[PDB]
Amino acid sequence: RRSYTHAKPPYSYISLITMAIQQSPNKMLTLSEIYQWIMDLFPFYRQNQQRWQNSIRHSLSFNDCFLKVPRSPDKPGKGSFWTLHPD
DNA sequence: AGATTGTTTACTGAGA
DNA sequence: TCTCAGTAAACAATCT
Ligand SMILES: [K+]
C-alpha cells in the first residue's frame, strides 16, 4: 500500500469554514463537524491535521465573521456551534 | 488526568 | 512596504 499526493483546493480557511456552515441544515456546525466536512470533501486535508486544524481554530476565533453559539442547556455537549455573523 | 476546544500573541511569507 | 492569511505555540476552559 502506498500514499498519494493531492493538491490543496483553492479556498482560504475562511472560505472552507463559510461553505461548511452555509451548507449545513441549521446554518451552524461544531468544530469537529467543520473538520469532518472539509476532510470528507477535500482529501488533501486528510493529512497534517494537527497543523491545519490549529489554523481553523485560530481563524474561527480571530475573525469577527464567525460567531460562537452556545448549546441550549437542555442539550449539553462538547464545544459550541459556529455560525456566520449576521453581517 | 487526558484530550478537545477556544483565545491570544507573535511571526512570516504571498501578493499587490 | 504594507495588509492579510497561515503557522506556531502558550495557556485556560471544559469536555471525556
Ligand atoms: K470570532
Side-chain angles (χ1 to χ4, degrees), chain A residues 16-31 33-34 37 60 65-70 80-87:
Chain A
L16 294 170
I17 297 161
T18 302
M19 317 217 264
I21 291 162
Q22 288 185 309
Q23 63 77 56
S24 63
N26 312 126
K27 309 279 172 263
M28 82 178 175
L29 299 186
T30 65
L31 183 62
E33 287 179 340
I34 291 166
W37 180 86
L60 285 166
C65 51
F66 304 125
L67 168 61
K68 215 167 56 187
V69 189
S80 294
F81 299 99
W82 290 97
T83 200
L84 293 160
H85 188 283
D87 213 11

Side-chain angles (χ1 to χ4, degrees), chain A residues 2-87:
Chain A
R2 71 161 272 180
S3 97
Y4 300 97
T5 291
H6 295 82
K8 196 182 180 141
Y11 293 113
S12 64
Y13 288 133
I14 282 162
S15 298
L16 294 170
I17 297 161
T18 302
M19 317 217 264
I21 291 162
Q22 288 185 309
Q23 63 77 56
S24 63
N26 312 126
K27 309 279 172 263
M28 82 178 175
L29 299 186
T30 65
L31 183 62
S32 53
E33 287 179 340
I34 291 166
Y35 299 159
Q36 192 68 42
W37 180 86
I38 293 173
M39 288 181 314
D40 275 5
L41 188 127
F42 302 112
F44 166 110
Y45 286 114
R46 293 180 198 170
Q47 327 267 24
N48 305 301
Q49 314 180 14
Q50 174 251 37
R51 184 153 81 220
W52 66 262
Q53 293 174 359
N54 198 346
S55 300
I56 290 284
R57 293 191 305 278
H58 166 85
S59 150
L60 285 166
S61 289
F62 185 69
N63 289 114
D64 303 333
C65 51
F66 304 125
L67 168 61
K68 215 167 56 187
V69 189
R71 290 173 180 272
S72 288
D74 287 37
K75 284 281 183 280
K78 177 169 47 101
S80 294
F81 299 99
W82 290 97
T83 200
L84 293 160
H85 188 283
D87 213 11

